[PDB]
């Protein structure tokens, strides 16, 4: 029962999931619908279809709560970034500027050991 | 720092002793010494209330100035560093420019002949005493007091220090030697620097006699008593105590701090 | 190397107007081969950029 | 270190004829000065092995020059020994 005409959209697209949360410009989440939140489980949560449908769910929840336009911050080496962007665009929301906010450590924390599979 | 004895006797085999390299003037100041006598851990009723006390070497008390309130703006010169049998740190004798002598806890790096200031305008140097409002955050301080004018009470043992985390409105957050975060009023006074003699914890007393000199009497385990004496007593051979560990008066292990003490509102985070 | 060409040129970390060059739009120090400088002048430029970032005349991470 | 005038002072103190720099006497004097300075520095920074190696090299060079001057002129060797220091 709020009204936030402008807000922010955060998409976290990783190799195992895709989280699409929509916040006000101060960063307070209004909706957070995810690939697991929509019907999906297992490794299918990282599929582009799952990411795009999660974007649809987030966009419709934002429309219900009263959001008309949001900027998009994306991060993670996921493949659902562009599909989520297109769904957010042509699902009744305007994206505006697209920015990448992926963290970049200046040689900080040591990564885990390489996979010997 | 620490001098190791040679294994000339079984009692000396592994022992060590301070070299006392920081000490000058091996005698105290006659006008700042008060008498002391032992108690053996007995209270006004004449009954043992603390066990394992007694014997011990004779001692005399040296008046330590734990307030440092009335000499603001008056400089002092460090005249001597002396041994003190009543604490683990060393003490420094101060000659004030007004003609008065005082004893303070010797901080780390306060060699003889230095100048010590006090008050809000004092510089941030080891030995300078200031109210917490004038000490910048992140400093290492010691001899802090709980109430304004109450006298230093925290971080007084050898090697102790307190980190001033920050001052919020009228309270200062302190990281205390145990690791507990606490808030005290910004008007409380503190001394800049760390307490000296930090290596005394590595001293290896070699024999029972040395602790008898230091005034510590033998301690008997509960599992070798009779059940009329201790809850752990009894058994045919040696046992582990027939129950969960308890005190000699039957109290189980666990927190003993009062659960609703008035000071709970001043403690930010309990120690690990 | 423009500094080798035009000799007697002061390279300073406070010279933010000159140091704006040799950095990308994201605050990335430009490559030596891209700038065309020699090794010594490239190292001096990098040191000046680092000092400027330390004294907050240039941003560490630009977004 | 051994700045210009610092070198010149020892050079005129231990030289042969008002301009000598490469004689065993002047070389040994300068090496002794460098060795003393390096050891005094090494009382601090006890883990400066890269400079302790240079100090050892200087010690070896001075020892070789001392041996040469001792073999070539016993009187000059004794004079330099009393003027600088041995054992």
């Amino acid at each position: 029962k709020k009204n936030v005409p402008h807000g922010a959209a955060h998409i976290k697209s990783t190799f195992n999931n895709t989280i699409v949360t929509i916040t006000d410009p101060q960063g307070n989440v209004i909706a957070w619908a995810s690939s697991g939140h929509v019907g999906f489980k297992g490794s299918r949560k990282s599929t582009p279809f799952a990411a795009q449908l999660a974007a649809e769910n987030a966009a419709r929840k934002a429309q219900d709560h009263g959001v008309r336009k949001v900027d998009v911050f994306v991060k993670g080496p996921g493949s659902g970034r562009e599909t989520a962007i297109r769904s957010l665009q042509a699902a009744g929301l305007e994206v505006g500027a697209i920015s990448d906010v992926t963290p970049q450590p200046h040689n900080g924390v040591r990564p885990p050991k390489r996979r010997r599979v | 720092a620490i001098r190791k004895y040679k294994p000339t006797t079984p009692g000396r085999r592994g022992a060590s002793v301070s070299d006392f390299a920081e000490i000058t003037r091996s005698t105290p100041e006659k006008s700042l010494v008060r008498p002391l006598h032992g108690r053996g851990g007995r209270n006004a009723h004449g009954r043992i209330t603390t066990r394992h006390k007694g014997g011990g070497h004779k001692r005399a008390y040296r008046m330590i100035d734990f307030r440092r309130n009335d000499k603001d703006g008056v400089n002092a010169k460090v005249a001597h560093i002396e041994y003190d049998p009543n604490r683990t740190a060393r003490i420094a004798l101060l000659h004030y420019l007004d003609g008065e002598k005082r004893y303070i806890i010797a901080p780390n790096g306060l060699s003889q002949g230095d100048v010590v200031e006090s008050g809000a305008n004092a510089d941030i140097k080891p030995g300078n005493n200031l109210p917490l409002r004038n000490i910048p955050a992140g400093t290492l301080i010691h001899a802090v007091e709980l109430r304004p004018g109450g006298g230093a009470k925290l971080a007084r043992s050898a090697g102790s220090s307190i980190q001033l985390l920050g001052k919020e409105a009228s309270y200062a957050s302190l990281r205390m030697p145990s690791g507990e975060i606490r808030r005290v009023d910004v008007r409380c006074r503190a001394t800049v620097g760390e307490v000296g003699n930090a290596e005394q914890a590595n001293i290896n007393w070699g024999k029972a006699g040395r602790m008898r000199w230091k005034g510590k009497r033998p301690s008997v385990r509960g599992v070798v008593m009779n059940p009329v004496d201790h809850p752990h007593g009894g058994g045919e051979g040696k046992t582990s105590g027939g129950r969960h560990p308890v005190s000699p008066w039957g109290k189980p292990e666990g927190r003993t701090r009062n659960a609703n003490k008035s000071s709970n509102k001043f403690i930010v985070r309990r120690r690990r | 190397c423009v500094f080798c060409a035009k000799k007697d040129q002061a390279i300073d970390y406070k010279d933010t107007a000159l140091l704006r060059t040799y950095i990308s739009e994201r605050g990335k120090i430009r490559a030596r081969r891209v700038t065309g400088n020699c090794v010594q002048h490239q190292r001096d430029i990098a040191l000046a950029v680092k000092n400027a970032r330390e004294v907050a005349l240039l941003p560490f991470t630009s977004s | 270190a051994l700045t210009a005038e610092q070198k010149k002072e020892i050079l005129r103190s231990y030289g042969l004829h008002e301009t000598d720099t490469g004689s065993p006497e002047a070389q040994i004097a300068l090496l002794t000065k460098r060795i003393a300075d390096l050891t005094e520095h090494l009382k601090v920074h006890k883990h400066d092995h890269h400079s302790r190696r240079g100090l050892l090299l200087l010690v070896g060079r001075r020892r070789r020059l001392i041996k040469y001057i001792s073999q070539i002129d016993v009187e000059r060797y004794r004079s330099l020994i009393e003027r600088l220091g041995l054992r």
Binding site: - | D123, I124, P136 | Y13, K14, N51, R53, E54, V55, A56, L57, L58, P59, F60 | -
Partner: protein
């Protein structure tokens, strides 16, 4: 006796007109120690590339002290001790 150049960053809360008398004492300590001050040009209010101590603005001063290393170290320690100084950086003009 070496030539130094020190840049000091002050909090924006202080006004830009009384800045010189405040650091005159930090110059006079060097003066007594036996150093000479070349130029104390003040850049005034400027924007920082990022927030420092929750401040988006600061005051820039170039001190340019030519004094002994121990004296310069003492001056830097005093500047860091002072709570109105946000950043301090000392570099040698020569090698």
């Amino acid at each position: 006796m070496r030539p130094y150049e020190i840049m000091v960053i002050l909090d924006p809360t202080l006004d830009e007109r009384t800045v010189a008398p405040s650091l005159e004492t930090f110059l006079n300590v060097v003066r007594k120690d036996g150093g000479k001050v070349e130029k104390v040009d003040i850049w005034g209010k400027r924007r920082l590339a990022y927030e420092i101590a929750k401040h988006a603005e600061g005051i820039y001063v170039v001190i340019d002290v030519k004094a002994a290393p121990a004296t310069v170290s003492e001056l830097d320690r005093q500047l860091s001790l002072n709570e109105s100084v946000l950043r301090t950086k000392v570099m040698r003009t020569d090698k």
